[PDB]
Amino acid sequence: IPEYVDWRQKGAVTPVKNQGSCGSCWAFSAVVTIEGIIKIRTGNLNQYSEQELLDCDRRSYGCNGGYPWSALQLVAQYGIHYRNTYPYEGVQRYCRSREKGPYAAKTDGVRQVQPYNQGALLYSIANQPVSVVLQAAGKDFQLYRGGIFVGPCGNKVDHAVAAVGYGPNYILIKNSWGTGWGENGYIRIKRGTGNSYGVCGLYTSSFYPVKN
Numbered sequence: 001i002p003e004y005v006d007w008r009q010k011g012a013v014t015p016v017k018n019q020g021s022c023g024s025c026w027a028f029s030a031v032v033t034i035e036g037i038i039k040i041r042t043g044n045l046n047q048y049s050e051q052e053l054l055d056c057d058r059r060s061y062g063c064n065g066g067y068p069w070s071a072l073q074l075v076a077q078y079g080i081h082y083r084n085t086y087p088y089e090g091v092q093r094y095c096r097s098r099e100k101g102p103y104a105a106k107t108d109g110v111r112q113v114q115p116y117n118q119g120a121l122l123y124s125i126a127n128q129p130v131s132v133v134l135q136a137a138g139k140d141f142q143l144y145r146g147g148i149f150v151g152p153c154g155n156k157v158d159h160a161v162a163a164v165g166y167g168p169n170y171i172l173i174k175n176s177w178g179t180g181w182g183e184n185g186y187i188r189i190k191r192g193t194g195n196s197y198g199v200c201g202l203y204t205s206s207f208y209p210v211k212n
Ligand SMILES: *CC(=O)[C@H](CCCCN)NS(=O)(=O)c1ccc(C)cc1
Pocket: 019, 020, 021, 022, 023, 024, 025, 026, 064, 065, 136, 137, 158, 159, 160, 176
């Protein structure tokens, strides 16, 4: 369980993206999750469509609300297309999955990490990236243009992102905003403080598919 875990230089995460004026934190977080695992075994890095997840997942409320843990489940159940055969537009619409044709990616299950346990988060993040939530409605996290976020912030979780590494002290997160935020679309939050919930409630509820 290395002292350092970066999947970027591991060839697991692709360039950064933006959800835009679409409240669709959840579908993006997912595509990265599934994505990671998909490349971890096969040795093939891919960019899947979040747009599809939006238009297809009726359980989620597309362009403004969702469950990073429906998306995944969805995929495993059905599947998910490339981000070319289903590029992101930013507006929820009619499911094209079927109309689009044969799927391209399809997992083999979804599991959740025991909330409120850093030790647990890491491990999984060590075996493969994960979808995690937190407080973004933040007025500080909103302004982050590079650094180690300690706060201030709260325990009112409401935005989903992704963890793509950690250090002895900083946890790495991929944001669904442009590369005109944090440190090039990236933000480092601090771990090991005692805060069980985890600063910004980053330890509330996390997840991930399964792959054979
Ligand atoms: C996570 C997400 O999509 C939310 C909106 C949820 C709304 C539920 N009522 N917004 S966001 O945090 O991604 C966001 C998007 C655009 C901007 C300018 C700020 C934040």
